[PDB]
Amino acid sequence: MGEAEKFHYIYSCDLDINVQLKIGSLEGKREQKSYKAVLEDPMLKFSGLYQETCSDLYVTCQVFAEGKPLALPVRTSYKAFSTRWNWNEWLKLPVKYPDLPRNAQVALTIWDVYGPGKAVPVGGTTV
């Protein structure tokens, strides 16, 4: 059991630095579609779902407040994944500490390749 007799805090309006969130690793299995699904849309074969290794996914993080995006989405640099999706990348968000409203949320969407030039979401989370 740790200890801390004093709580040190700062008002979000007083921290004049950008808010950074590091998208770490995505742990878990992404389910493959049936062959009938590949028959319905042949482009599915060329999708990242059909790469045997962990596809090189990236997460675009955009801050929303009251449903309106505060800034443009920031994307993780391309990284080649072998056995695990581990980005370990500190993302510099386009939102400053004083500019975040109380109801501010970060939406992170993981995207994979879906044929030539088309990205399809693998899945999303909002915190």
Added chain:
Amino acid sequence: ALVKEVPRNDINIYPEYILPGIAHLAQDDATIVRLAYAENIALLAETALRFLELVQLKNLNMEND
């Protein structure tokens, strides 16, 4: 963007009040302000341009009245 008719007293509202009134925002110290400026500078200009086109059409019609 909702202004569809320009009152006679505001024909020069854009060059002297709208555009000069927000011009200081394009250089604001707060990045959120400059961001709001960059996000809207394109819209503000397009809105002023719509106003100028309406004033010109109205002037052409008033000259033909």
